[PDB]
């Protein structure tokens, strides 16, 4: 099940604990992740609207999962694992947005608007999960912006 | 605490994961190198000097399993396992996906000494460096004690 909190501070605080010597080091990783997530999301979107290779979508979800999990971004890493198993034909259902945003412990977060072949069913689930990744990505940027007191 | 003066190699397919583990080694003045995949890890290990390798099992070009087996096979050919000082075998800590016994045996049967689950815990990463590194820097240092 998707974690209730957006940030796993237990994992991220030990990364922020290294900001004493290297000032704004953890902020640099967050900025570096935002560029990586936007690029990874674009590569996922390029395959859904273009050439379809579920092995690549399997690898794209695995790539972003390893970074988002190491930074404590649980929900992003959770959806990436869902895209990871959908490309491997291991899962056959991805819940809707209203069901996933109801799992947040603090419910004051969502006060904004959310924007044939043998593989057709899974590609729709991957396209539906990639869009869910965009919401979890935006929620993480808002949560990390408040902590660092900077825009993203 | 005191860290042993050993050379470390961390092998991960994500530069963000490499910067996290590298920040811990840099903070404690530990010399290290970075590898993108398994084929680079084997080539970097051939350059010599390594003591401890933190390698992910799943890698793009060459998997960490095959890289570990390729390193262990090369160590046996060169007599690794006074005319010439006995060069100790390199310590390989695998980066596994989960904490299941199947993920553990796959690393042990491939020639890895230990294992760490992903995402790598920096406190657990520290303990692995002292448990294995201090046994290579000090004589009769029992990390099991």
PDB file of C-alpha atoms in Angstrom:
ATOM      1  CA  UNK A   1       0.000   0.000   0.000  1.00  0.00           C
ATOM      2  CA  UNK A   2       1.149   3.556  -0.748  1.00  0.00           C
ATOM      3  CA  UNK A   3       2.751   5.258   2.285  1.00  0.00           C
ATOM      4  CA  UNK A   4       0.691   7.849   4.131  1.00  0.00           C
ATOM      5  CA  UNK A   5       3.408  10.529   4.290  1.00  0.00           C
ATOM      6  CA  UNK A   6       5.057  12.246   1.337  1.00  0.00           C
ATOM      7  CA  UNK A   7       8.521  12.562   2.923  1.00  0.00           C
ATOM      8  CA  UNK A   8      10.268   9.853   4.953  1.00  0.00           C
ATOM      9  CA  UNK A   9      12.295  12.199   7.142  1.00  0.00           C
ATOM     10  CA  UNK A  10      14.147   9.275   8.746  1.00  0.00           C
ATOM     11  CA  UNK A  11      15.907   8.708   5.416  1.00  0.00           C
ATOM     12  CA  UNK A  12      16.209  12.385   4.473  1.00  0.00           C
ATOM     13  CA  UNK A  13      17.426  13.746   7.828  1.00  0.00           C
ATOM     14  CA  UNK A  14      20.635  11.704   7.628  1.00  0.00           C
ATOM     15  CA  UNK A  15      21.206  13.316   4.225  1.00  0.00           C
ATOM     16  CA  UNK A  16      20.517  16.775   5.662  1.00  0.00           C
ATOM     17  CA  UNK A  17      22.886  15.843   8.506  1.00  0.00           C
ATOM     18  CA  UNK A  18      25.675  16.155   5.907  1.00  0.00           C
ATOM     19  CA  UNK A  19      24.804  19.795   5.120  1.00  0.00           C
ATOM     20  CA  UNK A  20      27.067  21.089   7.910  1.00  0.00           C
ATOM     21  CA  UNK A  21      30.291  20.919   5.893  1.00  0.00           C
ATOM     22  CA  UNK A  22      28.832  20.993   2.365  1.00  0.00           C
ATOM     23  CA  UNK A  23      26.318  23.814   2.747  1.00  0.00           C
ATOM     24  CA  UNK A  24      23.097  23.364   0.749  1.00  0.00           C
ATOM     25  CA  UNK A  25      24.216  19.879  -0.300  1.00  0.00           C
ATOM     26  CA  UNK A  26      20.833  18.241   0.302  1.00  0.00           C
ATOM     27  CA  UNK A  27      19.158  21.105  -1.563  1.00  0.00           C
ATOM     28  CA  UNK A  28      21.445  20.368  -4.507  1.00  0.00           C
ATOM     29  CA  UNK A  29      20.297  16.745  -4.539  1.00  0.00           C
ATOM     30  CA  UNK A  30      16.643  17.830  -4.506  1.00  0.00           C
ATOM     31  CA  UNK A  31      17.261  20.202  -7.419  1.00  0.00           C
ATOM     32  CA  UNK A  32      19.152  17.398  -9.164  1.00  0.00           C
ATOM     33  CA  UNK A  33      16.227  15.031  -8.551  1.00  0.00           C
ATOM     34  CA  UNK A  34      13.638  17.470  -9.925  1.00  0.00           C
ATOM     35  CA  UNK A  35      15.620  17.609 -13.168  1.00  0.00           C
ATOM     36  CA  UNK A  36      15.864  13.806 -13.147  1.00  0.00           C
ATOM     37  CA  UNK A  37      12.156  13.256 -12.461  1.00  0.00           C
ATOM     38  CA  UNK A  38      11.085  15.720 -15.161  1.00  0.00           C
ATOM     39  CA  UNK A  39      13.415  14.016 -17.642  1.00  0.00           C
ATOM     40  CA  UNK A  40      12.260  10.541 -16.585  1.00  0.00           C
ATOM     41  CA  UNK A  41       8.596  11.563 -16.822  1.00  0.00           C
ATOM     42  CA  UNK A  42       9.232  12.943 -20.314  1.00  0.00           C
ATOM     43  CA  UNK A  43      10.899   9.690 -21.381  1.00  0.00           C
ATOM     44  CA  UNK A  44       7.920   7.735 -20.036  1.00  0.00           C
ATOM     45  CA  UNK A  45       5.511  10.071 -21.835  1.00  0.00           C
ATOM     46  CA  UNK A  46       7.573   9.783 -25.028  1.00  0.00           C
ATOM     47  CA  UNK A  47       7.078   6.001 -25.045  1.00  0.00           C
ATOM     48  CA  UNK A  48       3.339   6.074 -24.300  1.00  0.00           C
ATOM     49  CA  UNK A  49       2.570   8.505 -27.134  1.00  0.00           C
ATOM     50  CA  UNK A  50       5.326   7.013 -29.310  1.00  0.00           C
ATOM     51  CA  UNK A  51       7.097   3.668 -29.598  1.00  0.00           C
ATOM     52  CA  UNK A  52       5.889   1.331 -26.850  1.00  0.00           C
ATOM     53  CA  UNK A  53       8.511  -0.778 -25.049  1.00  0.00           C
ATOM     54  CA  UNK A  54       7.328  -2.111 -21.689  1.00  0.00           C
ATOM     55  CA  UNK A  55      10.880  -3.181 -20.821  1.00  0.00           C
ATOM     56  CA  UNK A  56      11.977   0.459 -21.065  1.00  0.00           C
ATOM     57  CA  UNK A  57       9.019   1.611 -18.963  1.00  0.00           C
ATOM     58  CA  UNK A  58      10.084  -1.137 -16.558  1.00  0.00           C
ATOM     59  CA  UNK A  59      13.599   0.339 -16.498  1.00  0.00           C
ATOM     60  CA  UNK A  60      12.416   3.960 -16.359  1.00  0.00           C
ATOM     61  CA  UNK A  61      10.320   3.213 -13.283  1.00  0.00           C
ATOM     62  CA  UNK A  62      13.233   1.351 -11.706  1.00  0.00           C
ATOM     63  CA  UNK A  63      15.594   4.257 -12.400  1.00  0.00           C
ATOM     64  CA  UNK A  64      13.479   6.916 -10.682  1.00  0.00           C
ATOM     65  CA  UNK A  65      12.498   4.571  -7.838  1.00  0.00           C
ATOM     66  CA  UNK A  66      16.096   4.187  -6.668  1.00  0.00           C
ATOM     67  CA  UNK A  67      16.626   7.941  -6.378  1.00  0.00           C
ATOM     68  CA  UNK A  68      13.244   8.921  -4.927  1.00  0.00           C
ATOM     69  CA  UNK A  69      13.486   6.165  -2.307  1.00  0.00           C
ATOM     70  CA  UNK A  70      17.016   7.174  -1.282  1.00  0.00           C
ATOM     71  CA  UNK A  71      15.787  10.761  -0.784  1.00  0.00           C
ATOM     72  CA  UNK A  72      12.859   9.672   1.396  1.00  0.00           C
ATOM     73  CA  UNK A  73      10.238  10.433  -1.281  1.00  0.00           C
ATOM     74  CA  UNK A  74       8.159   7.365  -0.472  1.00  0.00           C
ATOM     75  CA  UNK A  75       5.053   8.018  -2.572  1.00  0.00           C
ATOM     76  CA  UNK A  76       7.055   8.734  -5.736  1.00  0.00           C
ATOM     77  CA  UNK A  77       9.062   5.537  -5.230  1.00  0.00           C
ATOM     78  CA  UNK A  78       5.833   3.621  -4.569  1.00  0.00           C
ATOM     79  CA  UNK A  79       4.174   4.649  -7.839  1.00  0.00           C
ATOM     80  CA  UNK A  80       7.441   3.971  -9.678  1.00  0.00           C
ATOM     81  CA  UNK A  81       7.315   0.408  -8.347  1.00  0.00           C
ATOM     82  CA  UNK A  82       3.737   0.150  -9.634  1.00  0.00           C
ATOM     83  CA  UNK A  83       4.829   1.255 -13.113  1.00  0.00           C
ATOM     84  CA  UNK A  84       7.713  -1.188 -12.658  1.00  0.00           C
ATOM     85  CA  UNK A  85       5.391  -4.164 -12.126  1.00  0.00           C
ATOM     86  CA  UNK A  86       2.836  -3.026 -14.720  1.00  0.00           C
ATOM     87  CA  UNK A  87       5.523  -3.207 -17.403  1.00  0.00           C
ATOM     88  CA  UNK A  88       6.431  -6.699 -16.167  1.00  0.00           C
ATOM     89  CA  UNK A  89       2.782  -7.865 -16.477  1.00  0.00           C
ATOM     90  CA  UNK A  90       2.798  -8.572 -12.723  1.00  0.00           C
ATOM     91  CA  UNK A  91      -0.031  -6.171 -11.792  1.00  0.00           C
ATOM     92  CA  UNK A  92      -3.352  -5.496 -13.511  1.00  0.00           C
ATOM     93  CA  UNK A  93      -4.913  -2.564 -11.623  1.00  0.00           C
ATOM     94  CA  UNK A  94      -3.858   0.939 -10.585  1.00  0.00           C
ATOM     95  CA  UNK A  95      -6.241   2.844  -8.278  1.00  0.00           C
ATOM     96  CA  UNK A  96      -7.632   6.257  -9.130  1.00  0.00           C
ATOM     97  CA  UNK A  97      -6.323   9.580  -7.838  1.00  0.00           C
ATOM     98  CA  UNK A  98      -9.156  10.241  -5.374  1.00  0.00           C
ATOM     99  CA  UNK A  99      -8.409   6.869  -3.771  1.00  0.00           C
ATOM    100  CA  UNK A 100      -4.666   7.539  -3.469  1.00  0.00           C
ATOM    101  CA  UNK A 101      -4.954  11.102  -2.131  1.00  0.00           C
ATOM    102  CA  UNK A 102      -7.275   9.857   0.626  1.00  0.00           C
ATOM    103  CA  UNK A 103      -4.337   7.970   2.184  1.00  0.00           C
ATOM    104  CA  UNK A 104      -2.540  11.144   3.298  1.00  0.00           C
ATOM    105  CA  UNK A 105      -2.269  11.438   7.080  1.00  0.00           C
ATOM    106  CA  UNK A 106      -2.510  15.240   6.982  1.00  0.00           C
ATOM    107  CA  UNK A 107      -5.487  16.011   4.742  1.00  0.00           C
ATOM    108  CA  UNK A 108      -4.842  19.768   4.444  1.00  0.00           C
ATOM    109  CA  UNK A 109      -2.446  19.120   1.544  1.00  0.00           C
ATOM    110  CA  UNK A 110      -4.839  18.587  -1.370  1.00  0.00           C
ATOM    111  CA  UNK A 111      -6.249  22.118  -1.751  1.00  0.00           C
ATOM    112  CA  UNK A 112      -5.448  22.440  -5.460  1.00  0.00           C
ATOM    113  CA  UNK A 113      -6.458  21.017  -8.826  1.00  0.00           C
ATOM    114  CA  UNK A 114      -4.892  17.818 -10.183  1.00  0.00           C
ATOM    115  CA  UNK A 115      -4.153  18.109 -13.911  1.00  0.00           C
ATOM    116  CA  UNK A 116      -6.497  -4.213 -29.093  1.00  0.00           C
ATOM    117  CA  UNK A 117      -2.956  -5.538 -28.717  1.00  0.00           C
ATOM    118  CA  UNK A 118      -1.651  -7.675 -25.858  1.00  0.00           C
ATOM    119  CA  UNK A 119      -0.237  -4.582 -24.101  1.00  0.00           C
ATOM    120  CA  UNK A 120      -3.095  -2.079 -24.501  1.00  0.00           C
ATOM    121  CA  UNK A 121      -4.493  -2.671 -21.005  1.00  0.00           C
ATOM    122  CA  UNK A 122      -1.152  -2.213 -19.235  1.00  0.00           C
ATOM    123  CA  UNK A 123      -0.169   0.888 -21.222  1.00  0.00           C
ATOM    124  CA  UNK A 124      -3.344   2.609 -20.015  1.00  0.00           C
ATOM    125  CA  UNK A 125      -2.425   1.699 -16.434  1.00  0.00           C
ATOM    126  CA  UNK A 126       1.112   3.004 -16.981  1.00  0.00           C
ATOM    127  CA  UNK A 127      -0.275   6.182 -18.552  1.00  0.00           C
ATOM    128  CA  UNK A 128      -2.627   6.461 -15.572  1.00  0.00           C
ATOM    129  CA  UNK A 129       0.206   5.832 -13.098  1.00  0.00           C
ATOM    130  CA  UNK A 130       2.594   8.262 -14.806  1.00  0.00           C
ATOM    131  CA  UNK A 131      -0.027  10.971 -14.280  1.00  0.00           C
ATOM    132  CA  UNK A 132      -0.320   9.946 -10.626  1.00  0.00           C
ATOM    133  CA  UNK A 133       3.461  10.334 -10.443  1.00  0.00           C
ATOM    134  CA  UNK A 134       3.069  13.949 -11.588  1.00  0.00           C
ATOM    135  CA  UNK A 135       0.775  14.724  -8.643  1.00  0.00           C
ATOM    136  CA  UNK A 136       3.048  12.983  -6.128  1.00  0.00           C
ATOM    137  CA  UNK A 137       5.972  14.843  -7.715  1.00  0.00           C
ATOM    138  CA  UNK A 138       4.212  18.196  -7.307  1.00  0.00           C
ATOM    139  CA  UNK A 139       3.209  17.420  -3.713  1.00  0.00           C
ATOM    140  CA  UNK A 140       6.823  16.560  -2.873  1.00  0.00           C
ATOM    141  CA  UNK A 141       8.085  19.808  -4.412  1.00  0.00           C
ATOM    142  CA  UNK A 142       5.586  21.786  -2.327  1.00  0.00           C
ATOM    143  CA  UNK A 143       6.589  19.901   0.827  1.00  0.00           C
ATOM    144  CA  UNK A 144      10.322  20.297   0.174  1.00  0.00           C
ATOM    145  CA  UNK A 145       9.866  23.972  -0.733  1.00  0.00           C
ATOM    146  CA  UNK A 146       8.398  24.712   2.703  1.00  0.00           C
ATOM    147  CA  UNK A 147      11.283  22.962   4.471  1.00  0.00           C
ATOM    148  CA  UNK A 148      14.113  24.625   2.532  1.00  0.00           C
ATOM    149  CA  UNK A 149      12.205  27.957   2.510  1.00  0.00           C
ATOM    150  CA  UNK A 150      12.976  28.249  -1.218  1.00  0.00           C
ATOM    151  CA  UNK A 151      10.901  27.861  -4.375  1.00  0.00           C
ATOM    152  CA  UNK A 152      11.662  24.188  -5.145  1.00  0.00           C
TER     153      UNK A 152
ATOM    154  CA  UNK B   1      34.538   7.476  15.746  1.00  0.00           C
ATOM    155  CA  UNK B   2      37.677   6.277  13.944  1.00  0.00           C
ATOM    156  CA  UNK B   3      37.357   4.997  10.373  1.00  0.00           C
ATOM    157  CA  UNK B   4      39.906   2.720   8.676  1.00  0.00           C
ATOM    158  CA  UNK B   5      42.017   4.112   5.841  1.00  0.00           C
ATOM    159  CA  UNK B   6      40.665   1.888   3.071  1.00  0.00           C
ATOM    160  CA  UNK B   7      39.770   2.425  -0.582  1.00  0.00           C
ATOM    161  CA  UNK B   8      36.078   2.014  -1.412  1.00  0.00           C
ATOM    162  CA  UNK B   9      34.150   1.546  -4.660  1.00  0.00           C
ATOM    163  CA  UNK B  10      30.402   2.212  -4.842  1.00  0.00           C
ATOM    164  CA  UNK B  11      28.603   0.990  -7.972  1.00  0.00           C
ATOM    165  CA  UNK B  12      25.079   2.269  -8.651  1.00  0.00           C
ATOM    166  CA  UNK B  13      23.150   3.062 -11.831  1.00  0.00           C
ATOM    167  CA  UNK B  14      21.930   6.450 -10.534  1.00  0.00           C
ATOM    168  CA  UNK B  15      24.188   9.469 -10.058  1.00  0.00           C
ATOM    169  CA  UNK B  16      21.921  10.754  -7.276  1.00  0.00           C
ATOM    170  CA  UNK B  17      22.474   7.522  -5.346  1.00  0.00           C
ATOM    171  CA  UNK B  18      26.209   7.856  -6.027  1.00  0.00           C
ATOM    172  CA  UNK B  19      26.264  11.386  -4.593  1.00  0.00           C
ATOM    173  CA  UNK B  20      24.537  10.276  -1.380  1.00  0.00           C
ATOM    174  CA  UNK B  21      26.984   7.464  -0.612  1.00  0.00           C
ATOM    175  CA  UNK B  22      29.916   9.543  -1.851  1.00  0.00           C
ATOM    176  CA  UNK B  23      28.978  12.379   0.499  1.00  0.00           C
ATOM    177  CA  UNK B  24      29.340  10.043   3.479  1.00  0.00           C
ATOM    178  CA  UNK B  25      32.765   8.828   2.343  1.00  0.00           C
ATOM    179  CA  UNK B  26      33.921  12.376   1.575  1.00  0.00           C
ATOM    180  CA  UNK B  27      32.736  13.605   4.983  1.00  0.00           C
ATOM    181  CA  UNK B  28      34.888  10.979   6.736  1.00  0.00           C
ATOM    182  CA  UNK B  29      37.930  11.404   4.434  1.00  0.00           C
ATOM    183  CA  UNK B  30      37.543   7.971   2.814  1.00  0.00           C
ATOM    184  CA  UNK B  31      39.145   7.592  -0.609  1.00  0.00           C
ATOM    185  CA  UNK B  32      36.685   6.211  -3.140  1.00  0.00           C
ATOM    186  CA  UNK B  33      35.846   5.795  -6.813  1.00  0.00           C
ATOM    187  CA  UNK B  34      32.541   5.721  -8.683  1.00  0.00           C
ATOM    188  CA  UNK B  35      31.316   3.124 -11.180  1.00  0.00           C
ATOM    189  CA  UNK B  36      28.265   3.335 -13.457  1.00  0.00           C
ATOM    190  CA  UNK B  37      27.714  -0.369 -14.169  1.00  0.00           C
ATOM    191  CA  UNK B  38      29.297  -3.750 -13.497  1.00  0.00           C
ATOM    192  CA  UNK B  39      31.748  -3.656 -16.393  1.00  0.00           C
ATOM    193  CA  UNK B  40      33.242  -0.440 -15.007  1.00  0.00           C
ATOM    194  CA  UNK B  41      33.463  -2.018 -11.545  1.00  0.00           C
ATOM    195  CA  UNK B  42      35.500  -4.932 -12.905  1.00  0.00           C
ATOM    196  CA  UNK B  43      37.775  -2.573 -14.847  1.00  0.00           C
ATOM    197  CA  UNK B  44      38.235  -0.273 -11.844  1.00  0.00           C
ATOM    198  CA  UNK B  45      38.968  -3.275  -9.619  1.00  0.00           C
ATOM    199  CA  UNK B  46      41.639  -4.416 -12.089  1.00  0.00           C
ATOM    200  CA  UNK B  47      43.453  -1.138 -11.378  1.00  0.00           C
ATOM    201  CA  UNK B  48      44.140  -2.473  -7.873  1.00  0.00           C
ATOM    202  CA  UNK B  49      44.086  -0.822  -4.473  1.00  0.00           C
ATOM    203  CA  UNK B  50      40.446  -1.541  -3.628  1.00  0.00           C
ATOM    204  CA  UNK B  51      39.493  -2.903  -0.208  1.00  0.00           C
ATOM    205  CA  UNK B  52      35.692  -2.616  -0.021  1.00  0.00           C
ATOM    206  CA  UNK B  53      33.109  -2.587  -2.825  1.00  0.00           C
ATOM    207  CA  UNK B  54      29.467  -1.560  -2.358  1.00  0.00           C
ATOM    208  CA  UNK B  55      27.833  -2.906  -5.502  1.00  0.00           C
ATOM    209  CA  UNK B  56      24.216  -3.001  -6.634  1.00  0.00           C
ATOM    210  CA  UNK B  57      23.062  -6.388  -7.900  1.00  0.00           C
ATOM    211  CA  UNK B  58      21.049  -4.990 -10.826  1.00  0.00           C
ATOM    212  CA  UNK B  59      23.219  -2.929 -13.186  1.00  0.00           C
ATOM    213  CA  UNK B  60      22.644  -1.816 -16.802  1.00  0.00           C
ATOM    214  CA  UNK B  61      25.510  -3.325 -18.799  1.00  0.00           C
ATOM    215  CA  UNK B  62      26.836  -6.091 -16.524  1.00  0.00           C
ATOM    216  CA  UNK B  63      24.890  -7.163 -13.445  1.00  0.00           C
ATOM    217  CA  UNK B  64      26.511  -6.934 -10.031  1.00  0.00           C
ATOM    218  CA  UNK B  65      26.123 -10.702  -9.680  1.00  0.00           C
ATOM    219  CA  UNK B  66      28.215 -11.428 -12.774  1.00  0.00           C
ATOM    220  CA  UNK B  67      30.683  -8.673 -11.870  1.00  0.00           C
ATOM    221  CA  UNK B  68      31.183 -10.216  -8.425  1.00  0.00           C
ATOM    222  CA  UNK B  69      31.659 -13.675  -9.940  1.00  0.00           C
ATOM    223  CA  UNK B  70      34.066 -12.175 -12.478  1.00  0.00           C
ATOM    224  CA  UNK B  71      36.097 -10.560  -9.685  1.00  0.00           C
ATOM    225  CA  UNK B  72      36.172 -13.747  -7.597  1.00  0.00           C
ATOM    226  CA  UNK B  73      37.280 -15.773 -10.625  1.00  0.00           C
ATOM    227  CA  UNK B  74      40.089 -13.318 -11.388  1.00  0.00           C
ATOM    228  CA  UNK B  75      41.219 -13.475  -7.751  1.00  0.00           C
ATOM    229  CA  UNK B  76      41.550 -17.265  -7.927  1.00  0.00           C
ATOM    230  CA  UNK B  77      43.617 -17.105 -11.124  1.00  0.00           C
ATOM    231  CA  UNK B  78      46.079 -14.718  -9.442  1.00  0.00           C
ATOM    232  CA  UNK B  79      46.266 -16.754  -6.225  1.00  0.00           C
ATOM    233  CA  UNK B  80      44.049 -14.634  -3.968  1.00  0.00           C
ATOM    234  CA  UNK B  81      41.822 -16.248  -1.350  1.00  0.00           C
ATOM    235  CA  UNK B  82      57.683 -14.205   2.459  1.00  0.00           C
ATOM    236  CA  UNK B  83      58.235 -14.135  -1.300  1.00  0.00           C
ATOM    237  CA  UNK B  84      55.258 -11.877  -2.042  1.00  0.00           C
ATOM    238  CA  UNK B  85      52.906 -10.390   0.528  1.00  0.00           C
ATOM    239  CA  UNK B  86      49.534 -12.135   0.656  1.00  0.00           C
ATOM    240  CA  UNK B  87      47.082  -9.746  -1.000  1.00  0.00           C
ATOM    241  CA  UNK B  88      43.738 -10.137   0.745  1.00  0.00           C
ATOM    242  CA  UNK B  89      40.571 -10.647  -1.323  1.00  0.00           C
ATOM    243  CA  UNK B  90      38.455  -7.551  -1.835  1.00  0.00           C
ATOM    244  CA  UNK B  91      35.334  -7.230   0.312  1.00  0.00           C
ATOM    245  CA  UNK B  92      32.120  -6.953  -1.715  1.00  0.00           C
ATOM    246  CA  UNK B  93      28.939  -5.723  -0.024  1.00  0.00           C
ATOM    247  CA  UNK B  94      25.915  -6.281  -2.248  1.00  0.00           C
ATOM    248  CA  UNK B  95      23.060  -3.779  -2.506  1.00  0.00           C
ATOM    249  CA  UNK B  96      19.946  -5.958  -2.544  1.00  0.00           C
ATOM    250  CA  UNK B  97      16.335  -5.079  -3.323  1.00  0.00           C
ATOM    251  CA  UNK B  98      14.626  -6.529  -0.229  1.00  0.00           C
ATOM    252  CA  UNK B  99      15.570  -8.286   3.015  1.00  0.00           C
ATOM    253  CA  UNK B 100      14.406 -11.722   1.848  1.00  0.00           C
ATOM    254  CA  UNK B 101      16.568 -14.822   2.173  1.00  0.00           C
ATOM    255  CA  UNK B 102      16.498 -15.310  -1.614  1.00  0.00           C
ATOM    256  CA  UNK B 103      18.057 -11.888  -2.137  1.00  0.00           C
ATOM    257  CA  UNK B 104      20.638 -12.750   0.536  1.00  0.00           C
ATOM    258  CA  UNK B 105      21.632 -16.152  -0.858  1.00  0.00           C
ATOM    259  CA  UNK B 106      21.879 -14.759  -4.395  1.00  0.00           C
ATOM    260  CA  UNK B 107      24.504 -12.325  -3.092  1.00  0.00           C
ATOM    261  CA  UNK B 108      26.337 -14.883  -0.939  1.00  0.00           C
ATOM    262  CA  UNK B 109      26.407 -17.522  -3.690  1.00  0.00           C
ATOM    263  CA  UNK B 110      27.813 -14.894  -6.083  1.00  0.00           C
ATOM    264  CA  UNK B 111      30.868 -14.199  -3.912  1.00  0.00           C
ATOM    265  CA  UNK B 112      29.711 -11.206  -1.854  1.00  0.00           C
ATOM    266  CA  UNK B 113      30.801 -10.975   1.774  1.00  0.00           C
ATOM    267  CA  UNK B 114      27.788  -9.057   3.121  1.00  0.00           C
ATOM    268  CA  UNK B 115      24.616  -7.332   1.929  1.00  0.00           C
ATOM    269  CA  UNK B 116      22.647  -4.108   2.373  1.00  0.00           C
ATOM    270  CA  UNK B 117      19.048  -3.486   1.349  1.00  0.00           C
ATOM    271  CA  UNK B 118      18.059  -0.493  -0.775  1.00  0.00           C
ATOM    272  CA  UNK B 119      17.564   2.370  -0.175  1.00  0.00           C
ATOM    273  CA  UNK B 120      20.972   2.216   1.498  1.00  0.00           C
ATOM    274  CA  UNK B 121      20.836   3.260   5.148  1.00  0.00           C
ATOM    275  CA  UNK B 122      23.705   5.640   5.902  1.00  0.00           C
ATOM    276  CA  UNK B 123      23.925   4.361   9.479  1.00  0.00           C
ATOM    277  CA  UNK B 124      24.050   0.799   8.138  1.00  0.00           C
ATOM    278  CA  UNK B 125      26.538   1.902   5.472  1.00  0.00           C
ATOM    279  CA  UNK B 126      28.768   3.242   8.254  1.00  0.00           C
ATOM    280  CA  UNK B 127      28.607   0.034  10.287  1.00  0.00           C
ATOM    281  CA  UNK B 128      29.576  -2.070   7.261  1.00  0.00           C
ATOM    282  CA  UNK B 129      32.656   0.100   6.671  1.00  0.00           C
ATOM    283  CA  UNK B 130      33.890  -0.286  10.252  1.00  0.00           C
ATOM    284  CA  UNK B 131      32.984  -3.979  10.524  1.00  0.00           C
ATOM    285  CA  UNK B 132      34.833  -4.976   7.341  1.00  0.00           C
ATOM    286  CA  UNK B 133      37.352  -2.154   6.944  1.00  0.00           C
ATOM    287  CA  UNK B 134      38.809  -2.353  10.449  1.00  0.00           C
ATOM    288  CA  UNK B 135      39.455  -6.088  10.006  1.00  0.00           C
ATOM    289  CA  UNK B 136      41.607  -5.233   6.992  1.00  0.00           C
ATOM    290  CA  UNK B 137      43.431  -2.412   8.812  1.00  0.00           C
ATOM    291  CA  UNK B 138      43.899  -4.058  12.232  1.00  0.00           C
ATOM    292  CA  UNK B 139      45.138  -7.516  13.214  1.00  0.00           C
ATOM    293  CA  UNK B 140      42.747  -9.882  15.028  1.00  0.00           C
ATOM    294  CA  UNK B 141      39.992  -7.245  15.104  1.00  0.00           C
ATOM    295  CA  UNK B 142      36.874  -9.331  15.787  1.00  0.00           C
ATOM    296  CA  UNK B 143      33.887  -7.477  14.340  1.00  0.00           C
ATOM    297  CA  UNK B 144      31.629 -10.328  15.496  1.00  0.00           C
ATOM    298  CA  UNK B 145      32.454  -9.438  19.122  1.00  0.00           C
TER     299      UNK B 145
END
